[PDB]
Amino acid sequence: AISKNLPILKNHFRKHWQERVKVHFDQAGKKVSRRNARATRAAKIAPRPLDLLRPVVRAPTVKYNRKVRAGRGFTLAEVKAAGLTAAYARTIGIAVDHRRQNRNQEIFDANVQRLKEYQSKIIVFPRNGKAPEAEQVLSAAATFPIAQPATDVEARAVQDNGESAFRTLRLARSEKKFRGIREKRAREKAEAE
Amino acid sequence: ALIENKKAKLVLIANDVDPIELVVFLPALCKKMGVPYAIVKGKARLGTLVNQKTSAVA
Amino acid sequence: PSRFTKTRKHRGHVSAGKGRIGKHRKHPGGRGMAGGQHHHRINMDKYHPGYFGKVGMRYFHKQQAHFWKPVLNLDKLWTLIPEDKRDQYLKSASKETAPVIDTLAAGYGKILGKGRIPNVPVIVKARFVSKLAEEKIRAAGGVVELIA
Amino acid sequence: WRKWNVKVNHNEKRYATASAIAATAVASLVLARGHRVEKIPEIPLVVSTDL
Amino acid sequence: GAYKYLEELQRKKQSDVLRFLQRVRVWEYRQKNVIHRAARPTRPDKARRLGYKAKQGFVIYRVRVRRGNRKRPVPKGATYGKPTNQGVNELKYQRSLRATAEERVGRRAANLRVLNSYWVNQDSTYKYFEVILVDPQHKAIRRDARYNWICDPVHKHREARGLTATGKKSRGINKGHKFNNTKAGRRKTWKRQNTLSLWRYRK
Amino acid sequence: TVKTGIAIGLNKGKKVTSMTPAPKISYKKGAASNRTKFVRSLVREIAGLSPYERRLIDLIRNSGEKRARKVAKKRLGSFTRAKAKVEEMNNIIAASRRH
RNA sequence: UUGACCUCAAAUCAGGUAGGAGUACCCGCUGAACUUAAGCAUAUCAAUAAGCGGAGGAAAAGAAACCAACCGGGAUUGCCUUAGUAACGGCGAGUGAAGCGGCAAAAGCUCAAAUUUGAAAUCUGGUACCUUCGGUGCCCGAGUUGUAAUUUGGAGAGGG
RNA sequence: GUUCUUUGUAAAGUGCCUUCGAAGAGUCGAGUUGUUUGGGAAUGCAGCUCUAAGUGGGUGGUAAAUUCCAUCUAAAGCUAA
RNA sequence: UUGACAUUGUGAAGAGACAUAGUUUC
Ligand SMILES: [Mg+2]
Ligand SMILES: [Mg+2]
Ligand SMILES: [Mg+2]
Ligand SMILES: [Mg+2]
Ligand SMILES: [Mg+2]
Ligand SMILES: [Mg+2]
Ligand SMILES: [Mg+2]
Ligand SMILES: [Mg+2]
Ligand SMILES: [Mg+2]
Ligand SMILES: [Mg+2]
Ligand SMILES: [Mg+2]
Ligand SMILES: [Mg+2]
Ligand SMILES: [Mg+2]
Ligand SMILES: [Mg+2]
Ligand SMILES: [Mg+2]
Ligand SMILES: [Mg+2]
Ligand SMILES: [Mg+2]
Ligand SMILES: [Mg+2]
Ligand SMILES: [Mg+2]
Ligand SMILES: [Mg+2]
Ligand SMILES: [Mg+2]
Ligand SMILES: [Mg+2]
Ligand SMILES: [Mg+2]
Ligand SMILES: [Mg+2]
Ligand SMILES: [Mg+2]
Ligand SMILES: [Mg+2]
Ligand SMILES: [Mg+2]
Ligand SMILES: [Mg+2]
Ligand SMILES: [Mg+2]
Ligand SMILES: [Mg+2]
Ligand SMILES: [Mg+2]
Ligand SMILES: [Mg+2]
Ligand SMILES: [Mg+2]
Ligand SMILES: [Mg+2]
Ligand SMILES: [Mg+2]
Ligand SMILES: [Mg+2]
Ligand SMILES: [Mg+2]
Ligand SMILES: [Mg+2]
Ligand SMILES: [Mg+2]
Numbered sequence A: 001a002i003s004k005n006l007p008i009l010k011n012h013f014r015k016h017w018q019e020r021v022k023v024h025f026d027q028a029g030k031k032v033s034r035r036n037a038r039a040t041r042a043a044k045i046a047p048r049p050l051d052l053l054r055p056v057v058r059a060p061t062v063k064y065n066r067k068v069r070a071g072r073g074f075t076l077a078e079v080k081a082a083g084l085t086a087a088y089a090r091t092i093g094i095a096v097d098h099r100r101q102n103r104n105q106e107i108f109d110a111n112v113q114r115l116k117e118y119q120s121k122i123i124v125f126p127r128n129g130k131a132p133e134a135e136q137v138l139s140a141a142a143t144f145p146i147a148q149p150a151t152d153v154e155a156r157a158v159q160d161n162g163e164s165a166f167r168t169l170r171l172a173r174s175e176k177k178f179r180g181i182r183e184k185r186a187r188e189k190a191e192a193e
Numbered sequence B: 001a002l003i004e005n006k007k008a009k010l011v012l013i014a015n016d017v018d019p020i021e022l023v024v025f026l027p028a029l030c031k032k033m034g035v036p037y038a039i040v041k042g043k044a045r046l047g048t049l050v051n052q053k054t055s056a057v058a
Numbered sequence C: 001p002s003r004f005t006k007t008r009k010h011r012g013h014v015s016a017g018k019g020r021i022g023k024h025r026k027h028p029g030g031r032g033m034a035g036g037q038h039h040h041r042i043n044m045d046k047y048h049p050g051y052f053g054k055v056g057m058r059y060f061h062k063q064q065a066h067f068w069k070p071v072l073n074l075d076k077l078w079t080l081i082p083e084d085k086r087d088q089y090l091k092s093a094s095k096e097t098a099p100v101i102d103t104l105a106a107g108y109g110k111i112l113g114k115g116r117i118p119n120v121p122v123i124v125k126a127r128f129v130s131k132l133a134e135e136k137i138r139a140a141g142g143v144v145e146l147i148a
Numbered sequence D: 001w002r003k004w005n006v007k008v009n010h011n012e013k014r015y016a017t018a019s020a021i022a023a024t025a026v027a028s029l030v031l032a033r034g035h036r037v038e039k040i041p042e043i044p045l046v047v048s049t050d051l
Numbered sequence E: 001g002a003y004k005y006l007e008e009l010q011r012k013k014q015s016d017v018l019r020f021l022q023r024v025r026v027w028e029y030r031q032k033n034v035i036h037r038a039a040r041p042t043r044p045d046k047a048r049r050l051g052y053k054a055k056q057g058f059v060i061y062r063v064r065v066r067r068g069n070r071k072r073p074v075p076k077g078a079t080y081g082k083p084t085n086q087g088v089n090e091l092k093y094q095r096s097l098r099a100t101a102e103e104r105v106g107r108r109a110a111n112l113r114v115l116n117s118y119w120v121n122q123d124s125t126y127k128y129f130e131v132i133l134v135d136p137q138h139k140a141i142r143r144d145a146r147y148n149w150i151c152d153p154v155h156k157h158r159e160a161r162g163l164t165a166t167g168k169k170s171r172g173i174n175k176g177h178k179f180n181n182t183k184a185g186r187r188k189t190w191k192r193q194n195t196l197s198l199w200r201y202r203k
Numbered sequence F: 001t002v003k004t005g006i007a008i009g010l011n012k013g014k015k016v017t018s019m020t021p022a023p024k025i026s027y028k029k030g031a032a033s034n035r036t037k038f039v040r041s042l043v044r045e046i047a048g049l050s051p052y053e054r055r056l057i058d059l060i061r062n063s064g065e066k067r068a069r070k071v072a073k074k075r076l077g078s079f080t081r082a083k084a085k086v087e088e089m090n091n092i093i094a095a096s097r098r099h
Numbered sequence G: 001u002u003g004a005c006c007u008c009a010a011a012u013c014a015g016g017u018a019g020g021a022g023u024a025c026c027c028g029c030u031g032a033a034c035u036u037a038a039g040c041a042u043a044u045c046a047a048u049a050a051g052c053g054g055a056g057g058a059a060a061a062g063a064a065a066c067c068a069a070c071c072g073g074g075a076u077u078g079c080c081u082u083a084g085u086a087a088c089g090g091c092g093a094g095u096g097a098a099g100c101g102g103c104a105a106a107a108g109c110u111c112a113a114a115u116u117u118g119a120a121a122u123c124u125g126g127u128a129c130c131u132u133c134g135g136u137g138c139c140c141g142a143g144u145u146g147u148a149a150u151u152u153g154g155a156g157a158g159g160g
Numbered sequence H: 001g002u003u004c005u006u007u008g009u010a011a012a013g014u015g016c017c018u019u020c021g022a023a024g025a026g027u028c029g030a031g032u033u034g035u036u037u038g039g040g041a042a043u044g045c046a047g048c049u050c051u052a053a054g055u056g057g058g059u060g061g062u063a064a065a066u067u068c069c070a071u072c073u074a075a076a077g078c079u080a081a
Numbered sequence I: 001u002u003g004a005c006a007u008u009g010u011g012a013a014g015a016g017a018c019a020u021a022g023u024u025u026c
Helices: A027-044 A076-081 A086-091 A105-120 A166-177 A179-190 B021-032 B043-050 C006-010 C083-090 C131-139 D010-022 D027-032 E003-010 E018-031 E044-049 E097-108 E165-170 E186-193 F034-047 F051-063 F065-075 F079-097
Strands: A021-023 A056-058 A068-070 B011-014 B037-040 C071-073 C098-102 C110-112 C123-126 C143-146 E035-038 E058-066 E113-122 E126-134 E196-198
Touching: A056 A105, A076 A086, A076 A105, A166 A179, A166 C131, A166 C143, B011 B021, B011 B043, B021 B037, B021 E003, B021 F034, C083 C098, C110 C123, C110 C131, C131 C143, E003 E044, E003 F034, E018 E058, E018 E113, E018 E126, E035 E097, E058 E097, E097 E113, E097 E126, E097 E165, F051 F065, F051 F079, F065 F079
Parallel strands: A021 E196, B011 B037, C071 C110, C098 C123, C123 C143
Antiparallel strands: A056 A068, E035 E058, E058 E126, E113 E126
């Protein structure tokens, strides 16, 4: 049961796998049902747009942080700098998130400006009876796109202080490598009687 | 909270109260707060004067 | 499709191509990777040297993307400017106006040295450079701007 | 769970239908295909948008 | 209030006053029937923070469950199979003894719904529990928007499905990397990992 | 913090104009209180010392705060609760059978 | 002598509820061996079959004692991926998840712990009438060993 | 869409000053045993013994002691897609 | 079957340490 020169496959079908096969024969079916779902909802939902306003947010870790991406809710701080409370902003189609914090002003302002533009570009019908029929825009995400902030200019003067970049990394790497030791030698040499 | 706020001038504590825990700390509390207290026979008799079946304290 | 299969061609010949002597049985070698150290070892060393035993350190809970560092040689570099914008910059190779190439924004983590860029000055912003990659950038009168 | 549908690369898919459109001229093919076209004026056959 | 002292007092189980109490009560409980209705919470602070309220429709029940391991029943210890399965004596039973306590009363009151339970006493032979229940057909509970969720039929015999707080513990339902195997619920998440997902245009 | 601005090194990270947001109360969950300080001090002189606590302070006085910790680490969970327990006992002694 | 109280009883006492069925899917318990390893016990089959308890139209999960280590993200569920990877393993046969990223759907919250103390403000039941999925008047009853309002950490509370 | 009652000397939101800020225990946690997991000086679960704290507690995928840092807030609860 | 821990409490005599006051353990 081993022969010729062939990659070594690892195919896990030693359990009763035929029992657990899922063939999505209903792809087309469930896409229709999802289109009908959205349609039925957009009708129930009055001119309201099917989705809620979402904040700009910087994506985690080292791999994704370069990109900015839509977050969950707006951080009680950002909601407050835009001059409305949490409770009311939820009724307005703004998503609020008590868990997210602002350590970064540039993003903080982006979300307050996002809240500003949203408030301007919506109309909130009176409590009374009237309902002055307004023709739903279906998105918020499309009306209020989330775009990558521009970090620089195309061309600009070359400034070389001649410090080698690379070896500025070589050295930054080292200072952290030996930071612990060279503190122990500071401890140990303070003990000079 | 009365005893804690020193507003009580007399506290009557029952000798009953089967979860005796509800009460036992009151002698200490009344002492530390300077409130005079007394342990009264009849948790149910504390009730009658207060229009309950059993009052456990008055 | 089945009509092109060679089992259609075998109909009428007793043994289905499987031999009269040695037949087609269930699992003569055993099943799967059985015997990699015994009857199947001549095939394992030769075609799979190194299969058995360990090497090196275990790493518990090692998340790829900690190590994410796509690599881009000077071999390309300039490809990170759209060609219309690109040709404009090659001519007028200069200080005071030199193209800024954000390689992080392009999806790369390190710039290596494969070789030969023209003499146009460039401002290259990257997380990491090979030593030769940066020397070459300098020899065209550009620099590297370390970003994060 | 037998394979029922088949994936075709979008581009070659297009190449195919492009090829198929280009052959709806070429009356020899339309003729070879069935399609009684001897009695029609010209191919491609374009008709008023009023249709 | 009084409840803050009871809480702090109860955290001294080895204190001289509480282990006189512990010693007298555990004799009384052991005289009574293994399931017997409790007139009031003997820990009105504990019942209180578990959802109890003193109002018509809330029932308190006291139950004994024998301590120790589950001896795998099996005739004469004979296991008939591989030796890794040969064990009889050291096997531990994935559900808590408190889970068993809820289940046995929850059966004895079939019309009630088990809300929560709490530990009261134990000797070497028994652990003692007070189970707090609710009558879902009592109108004080059917009104009262706070508690009438218990009336919906999804909550029939929550303690037999592991939906009480203890059942949730032993089901291992908690967020994060320590609960991966049992979170969305263990057999379901197993089945997910072991399902073959075949699309129409095969990926 | 002030990130350096490079992708390795000590404070490695991108420089950003920073904020320091408003503190959450859920960060103060440990905080004592005037309410619970009183109750716990009160129940302590109600219920007194536990068996392992008596043998702990007599161990302290007659052995000291090293062998104490070593015992209380076996008794309690581990070495830090044993630290903080012996200290709680030191202040049982000092504040009482002394000053 | 009489009247309560605590706890425990009995009624063909007034009104209710539970059982059994089904069980494709769902929440749990319990639990194999054939098999694979070319033999075999650890392993595998499999946290599978059979056995037991319990729900629904979905069940369960769910507003973080989470993920992360970033310029950080932000309930749960699911799909595409992560990945046949990190890891487990007579490190043999074999096994094998998670974080990030895209998409589907989106939704949030309430108690315990607080003196209403210038007024238990709360509630089941009976009963009469009424505009009866209920309301109101009145009486038993519950309940201070705590029923309402108030507050739930994102807070929030007492003052001014 | 209409139309009858105004619920109210009721209820709710917001700015500043000040004082506070109650927050779940035979639990968390530890040892040991058994089971289970990819989880590896121990992933979860359970038995028995031990059993906390309040600038505390939990986690941070190599055991330990020391020093810091980050991140949440357990041992009670409801909830559509 | 044997040991330890738990269920496990009250006296008294005698051994046992801070090293010949009594909290403690057999
Ligand atoms: Mg598979
Ligand atoms: Mg199907
Ligand atoms: Mg949507
Ligand atoms: Mg209207
Ligand atoms: Mg084929
Ligand atoms: Mg042939
Ligand atoms: Mg032939
Ligand atoms: Mg052949
Ligand atoms: Mg033959
Ligand atoms: Mg032969
Ligand atoms: Mg190998
Ligand atoms: Mg009653
Ligand atoms: Mg068997
Ligand atoms: Mg085994
Ligand atoms: Mg429902
Ligand atoms: Mg697993
Ligand atoms: Mg009757
Ligand atoms: Mg049934
Ligand atoms: Mg088979
Ligand atoms: Mg075999
Ligand atoms: Mg064989
Ligand atoms: Mg055999
Ligand atoms: Mg298994
Ligand atoms: Mg197994
Ligand atoms: Mg079955
Ligand atoms: Mg069944
Ligand atoms: Mg039904
Ligand atoms: Mg549905
Ligand atoms: Mg919360
Ligand atoms: Mg999430
Ligand atoms: Mg392998
Ligand atoms: Mg397995
Ligand atoms: Mg809590
Ligand atoms: Mg088992
Ligand atoms: Mg284990
Ligand atoms: Mg440590
Ligand atoms: Mg964070
Ligand atoms: Mg509740
Ligand atoms: Mg639930």
